[PDB]
Amino acid sequence: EHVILLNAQGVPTGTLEKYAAHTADTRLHLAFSSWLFNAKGQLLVTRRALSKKAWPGVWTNSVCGHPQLGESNEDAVIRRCRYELGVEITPPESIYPDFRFRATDPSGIVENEVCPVFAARTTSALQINDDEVMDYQWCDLADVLHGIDATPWAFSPWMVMQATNREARKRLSAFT
Template identity: 55%
Template sequence: MVTWTVANLVSYSYHDQVEPRRRAYVQTTNAPDEHVILLDEEGRHIGTAPKYSMHGADTVLHLAFSCYVFNPLGAVLVTRRALTKTAWPGVWTNSFCGHPLPAEPLTQAVTRRASFELGLELDTLDLALPLFRYRATDSGGIVENEICPVYLATTLQEPTPNPDEVAEYAWTRPADLSRAVTDAPWAFSPWMALQVQELEVFRA
């Protein structure tokens, strides 16, 4: 288990790197024609748009989700985004994120992405922050603009990540992660840095 300190952000002592042949995840939708749900300022659905158009300099508000996965020891799973990701490549973040497809229930979308990104089956899934919203711009000028409900999940499994999505992963204590985010928020995804401040599980 990683003890997250500022030093870990540059040179961490334990991590799992994803090997290209280590693929137990399920191939589900991540197609070029995948669509996401557009929202107005009140959070109402106003249409759909291709997912690829949601990563630019003027990204419109759309629906997403974040999930934090915990194991039976109470450790939380953190992942490092693949270097090929369009937005925030190589950045440490929460367990996984995603977008529901049009007409897809959010809980179904979370389950789908857990399998696609990490090869995980979730045992429990609870909505923790139903109205979380953020807007952020990465160093390349890519804007994320999302209403992003946050879920907490549990699993008995060890991840088998999709290397197109995840470069590395680690299990760590929630309190250690909270301290690391407080000390160096720039080293993590901006949505996770904000979510950790709001989630009760990281305040202990």
Template identity: 55%
Template sequence: MSLSTLQHDSVILVDDAGRQIGTAQKNTVHTLDTPLHLAFSCYVFNSHGQVLITRRSLAKTTWPGVWTNSFCGHPLPGEDPDDAVRRRAQLELGLDLDQLKVVAPQFRYRATDASGIVENELCPVYRATTTAEPRVNPDEVMEFAWTDTSALHRAARDAPWAFSPWMVLQLRELGAHDA
């Protein structure tokens, strides 16, 4: 399916039950009073069972320079959710994904960045595998690391301020078996 330029700049607005209620331009939705919208997070694992974490580019509007899960994004209006995850993996990390599955379909969070900008997302969490090494897009990611899940859980527990708030919450919810 061909997606229009307008769709590429849009996010899907949802109600508290997760039903689509409209769309909004992405560059106008993230404000001091961000409406609830659809997003996704993904944790990518390699053949050694290590999880990929990334450090957000300093050019990012929210949480610049903070370590986070492998990648995040927003599905476009009319886009299949799995296709959205695969699209974003290519855009941010140059990765093809294998064994993509949703592990927390109803994850939702609201967090406020130091700048005052709010994230307010219904954000299904995915797990995927890959056999490739990332080729990062510097507009999105400034560095990456493969780590053991137990080390990631300890770090997020001991220094939550060093990580994105959504990742800290997701790790608490998922436990060691999924992320």
């Protein structure tokens, strides 16, 4: 498994092993972020396993990942939903297509990503992969947004950035 390095423009220029790619000096690459809601309109929020290299133990939006060469964003989402959460989903829909960010985690591990954001509805029950998720909570978007507005530090930095993007917030608010 790998990540896709991107030049100043979003042009793929090569790849790196996924583990070896996230360091104190992580280089720009391709990723995705996805927010999942069940049939009742609840948002799935997850807590990253303690073994994740970047932001271990941190509360975040439902599923995040790294598309592989030749893979569409939507397929990557479906893939990681299955892999991390054993869940089937409806076709992922665009909510923040130009999201990009760089941040540093408490141990100094950096993420540096072009990271289009999506949303989808689950169509099956979760089956948790504890190598990836250590905890999770089905909740009302509205409460999650309040939490994010009041104590952003309690959540991953990119979760906060996405939720406080005016357009992306409107679009998520329509999934409930």
